[PDB]
Every structure is written in structure tokens, then in C-alpha cells.
Amino acid sequence: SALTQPPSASGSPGQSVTISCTGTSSDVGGSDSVSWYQQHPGKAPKLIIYEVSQRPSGVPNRFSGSKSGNTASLTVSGLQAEDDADYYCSSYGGDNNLFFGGGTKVTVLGQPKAAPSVTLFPPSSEELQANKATLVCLISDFYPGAVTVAWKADSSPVKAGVETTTPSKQSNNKYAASSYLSLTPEQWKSHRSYSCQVTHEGSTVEKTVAPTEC
Amino acid sequence: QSALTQPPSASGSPGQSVTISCTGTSSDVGGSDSVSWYQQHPGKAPKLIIYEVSQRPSGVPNRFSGSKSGNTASLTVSGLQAEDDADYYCSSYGGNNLFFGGGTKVTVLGQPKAAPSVTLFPPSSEELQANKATLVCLISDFYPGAVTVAWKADSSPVKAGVETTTPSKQSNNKYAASSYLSLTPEQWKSHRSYSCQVTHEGSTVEKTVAPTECS
């Protein structure tokens, strides 16, 4: 039996948002065992409130928890991009039962546009010794999290051997991805250069690398 | 690092059994019979599946069993079913605070296992000229799509400046990710080496790179 949370809530940077967690007299209304967890997709939930109002060590004083009757509430003030996450409440009930809310996705509205930083790496000596010549185009610090990548061998398009990872949000709240091109040492040494062209929000960043002169 | 230690992953095929551990100290896991286990499917609420070491809440099948020996609690899932593929967490009371593990991803194998290809790249000449010395540890062609990365500066663990992408399925239906360490040129040039350690299916692969006079 789930506790009741709104599926979504939102706020702009620096604003406050309050989200609720409705249970029954025998769980939320029954004791001070209400906890709140903040979870970024693909990461473990982080405890932000326990015993209705208590913050663990390291949780900013911007997160406040309270309860009135059968409804617990979490308020997040001075919203920051890192606060954009899923929030789950829980409460013990009778008979060793532990109830969880269905989660609230809190959206921090209007986050700033950010162009990608692109760094193109030529093949490592270890992999060239291992008869491999992979290039990696590291793409970081971009927002929103959608990019397209094209590769060139000299000035010509590369139509095979390309993989680009699905962008993931990193600790600076901006996206990262890597495009990698698996070349043979012969393909790498036979061209004057390779280039990675990253398109983000209609603007392209191009980087070029060439076989070592060392 | 979480208060209790759980292995980052486990796997098995349908019908197999898996056992996952949760290690603490004598003041938490080994001090009482208060270990709880929680199951969580991506994008869904966690669910309590074991409490007080061995107790199953109503409706949790007997395929799930919990035990404890000294400072280590264990959860066994027998006859693995598709619905068991999830993240599993433990918790315990401590000397009367609550301590948690960092979670174990349990994968019900959907295709053959595949060990990752790990390629470690030193700083590129262009970024060094731009006063950056980012290293990239490319990890590809692995299954299950669960990986843990750690970096070392010489033999010392380095946590600061590390970012690792969430694994994503590539055109060959295997996973890829990259881990990048944002060093300054001073940090890069002043150490003997830097290493990328990739853990997958309980085994660790390490790659090391060191500065050169010419890039």
C-alpha cells in the first residue's frame, strides 16, 4: 500500500517547492518515523530527512520536513539545479510494515543553456601496440542533453565504426557523452587526420587529431 | 562510500540463485538483529523485502531469505525470475541510528556476459596547450551494463575531478561508458602515473598511463 505523493512538482532557480506525502493514522499519522530520500536516476537514494524533520550530516538546511495529521511535507528552498531529482517518502506503520510513497519528480525549471566542451584523443600507445586504434571524442558540460556527432577521415565523412553514448547528467548538473571510432592502426596511419564534429542546439564544435610526430 | 558495504553487482540466469552481502562493523550489523533489505526497480519506489535479518513482510515469497554471520548480513534470492532484476539495499541499526549500504545491482542475464574493453588515454596536445590535462578511460562492449570505476594517482585513490557516464547500450547491444578525470597539467606532470580501475562482474581490470616528453 503506497503513501500518496504528487507525481510532479517544479520551481525556478532560487524559489521554493513544497511536496506532500499522505498516509493513514496508522503510518504517517501514527509516529515520527517519516523519512525523505532524494534520488538522481542511476544513483542510490540519498536520505535527506529522517524522523519527520531531522537532516543527516551534510544535508543543507534548505531542506525542511514537517507533518500535520496524516500528511508529511518536504520543503526545498533556494532551488538549485542539483535539486532536480525524484523524492520518495517512507513511514513505518504497525506490525513491522514500512510504507513508501510513489515518488515526486521535482523539476528545476529554466536551467541555463551550455555549449559542449569537446576534447578529441588520438590512439594510446598501449592500444597501438595491441593492434588497435580507437579515437575518443569526449563531450562534456552541455545542456540540454541532446547532441549529434559526425566524424571525418581527412575531409570525408566516416560512415562506419562510430558509437556515441547516450548523454548522462554529471555532478555539475550538465551532460556528458563519448563518441568513439574504432579504427585499425592502418586506417589511422593512412589519413592526414580525423575530426569529431559535435552539434548541439544547431551549433557545431569541431576537433582534429593527427598521427604522432614523436 | 556508504556506511555499510555491499558488492556493486551480482548476476545469474533464470532459475539460478544469487547471494549478496552487506558488511558493517560490530556496532551496527554485528550489534543487533536489525538488518533490513530493500528492493528497488528503476524509476519506482523502494520496497522493504526483509526486516530483522530474516523476516519477510506479507506477500514477499520464500525465494528471498536473509541471514547474518558476525558483521556480514546476506540476502539470497533463489530461483531467479525476471522481476528480481533490480537494485538491492541493506540497512542496520547502529550504536540508535540507521546505517545503509550503497546498493547491489542484481541482473537476471538477458544475453551472454561480456568483459569490458578498457582503453586509457593520456592528455591530448591540444588540451595541454589549453591548460587542461583530462584523462579518459573508455569502457566498451560489456554486459551486464553495470560497472564501477576507481582512479589512482600513483597508488593513492583519487576521487576529486572524477566523472563516469551512465552505461548505455550501443549498436552491438553491449554497453559502453567513459570515466574522465579532470587534472591540471601540474597534477598530470608531477605524478609517476595515473590508473583507471574498472570493476565488472566482480573482477577488476586496471590500465595505467604516465607522462611523456612529447605528445
Residue numbers in the entry:
A (entry chain B): 2 to 215
B (entry chain A): 1 to 95, 97 to 216
Provide text from the study:
Five H LCs (H3, H6, H7, H9 and H10) and two M LCs (M7 and M8) were successfully crystallized and their 3D-structures solved. The crystal structures were all refined to satisfactory refinement parameters; in all cases the LCs were dimeric, with an overall quaternary arrangement closely matching that of the previously reported LC dimers. VL and CL domains display very different structural properties in the seven crystal structures.
Each of the seven LCs crystallized in a different space group, with distinct crystal packing; the crystallographic resolutions achieved ranged from 2.70 Å (H7) to 1.65 Å (H9). Mass spectrometry and non-reducing SDS-PAGE indicated that 100% of the LC dimers were covalently linked by a disulphide bond located at the chain C-terminus (data not shown). However, due to underlying local flexibility, only for H9 a well-defined electron density for such C-terminal intermolecular disulphide bond is visible. In the structures of all H LCs and in M7, the association interface is roughly symmetric, and is located on the five-stranded beta sheet (strands 1, 3, 4, 7, 8), where the 3, 4, 7, 8 strands establish the intermolecular contacts. Analysis of the data shows that the kinetics of proteolysis correlate well with amyloid propensity: H3, H6, H7, H9, and H16 are almost or totally proteolysed after 60 minutes, and more than 50% of H10, H15 and H18 LCs is cleaved after three hours. Inspection of the SDS-PAGE gels shows that the proteolysis pattern is different in different H LCs, suggesting that the sequence of proteolytic events, and not only their kinetics, may be characteristic of each H LC.
